[PDB]
Amino acid sequence: IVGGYTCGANTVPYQVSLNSGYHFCGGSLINSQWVVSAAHCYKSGIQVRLGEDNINVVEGNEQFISASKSIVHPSYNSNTLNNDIMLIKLKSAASLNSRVASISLPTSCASAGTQCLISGWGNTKSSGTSYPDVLKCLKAPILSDSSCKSAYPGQITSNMFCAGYLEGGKDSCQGDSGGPVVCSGKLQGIVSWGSGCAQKNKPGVYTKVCNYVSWIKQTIASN
Ligand SMILES: [Ca+2]
């Protein structure tokens, strides 16, 4: 997250870190046994780390649970990033508490202008590299479809939305991928892609979660 703030320990209780020897992507806990992330975060050997603040220090609220099954969206296209969503099932159910909690799925899509909370352990610099140990947060509005398409001609599908600031300076960045965009208490987005980070006229692009609620629910119901 570039241009954000330190969230505070365990203040984003649905935020997970995906770990394969190190943090490599975010995700969102959607029930005791399932995490939503980005399909482009897929790999084998995932351990889901819940209850994290500093990802390099055991601080006492963590739960580390291996993935038992990954399910990349049936229509994910890694070239265009259309349908950039996957589900991860945990080998055991997380123990839910005030610091480890699921985030509601949306029953309705969100509109341009709605404020949202974007979070992660990604790079905090738009030129150069500095990775935080503690969770970072950014409040950002959803941008209109028309301004998203004007920023990224030929690249925005109906499964994507932009959020952030056209003036630059505030955005998600490398290492935030797969993490949450929460608006009014609902998971509306997944950190997906953008051209660089925090550049003028290049806002972040996010997977439009409301389009996937039916798939998420029926996948969970049979897996
Ligand atoms: Ca920790």
Swiss-Prot record:
Name the encoding gene, please: PRSS1
Q: What residues does substrate bind to?
A: 171-172, 174-175, 177
From the UniProt record, give one GO term of the biological process aspect.
digestion
Q: In which tissues is it expressed?
A: Synthesized in the acinar cells of the pancreas.
Would I find Signal among this entry's keywords?
Answer: yes
UniProt cofactor note: Binds 1 Ca(2+) ion per subunit.
Give the EC number(s) under which this enzyme is classified.
3.4.21.4
Q: How is it modified after translation?
A: Subsequent cleavage after Lys-125 leads to alpha-trypsin. Further cleavage after Lys-170 yields pseudotrypsin. A cleavage may also occur after Arg-99. Not sulfated on tyrosine residue(s).
Principal location? secreted
Organism, as annotated: Bos taurus
Note the SS bond partners.
Answer: 7-137, 25-41, 109-210, 116-183, 148-162, 173-197
Name of the molecule in the record: Serine protease 1
Q: Where is the active site?
A: 40, 84, 177
Q: Which residues form the Peptidase S1 domain?
A: 1-221
Its UniProt entry gives the catalysed reaction(s) as: Preferential cleavage: Arg-|-Xaa, Lys-|-Xaa
Which InterPro entries does UniProt cross-reference here? Peptidase_S1_PA, Peptidase_S1_PA_chymotrypsin, Peptidase_S1A, Serine_Proteases_S1, Trypsin_dom, TRYPSIN_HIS, TRYPSIN_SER
Give the UniProt keywords, A-Z.
Answer: Calcium, Digestion, Disulfide bond, Hydrolase, Metal-binding, Protease, Secreted, Serine protease, Signal, Zymogen
Q: Where does the protein end up? A: Secreted, Extracellular space
Cited CDD domains: Tryp_SPc
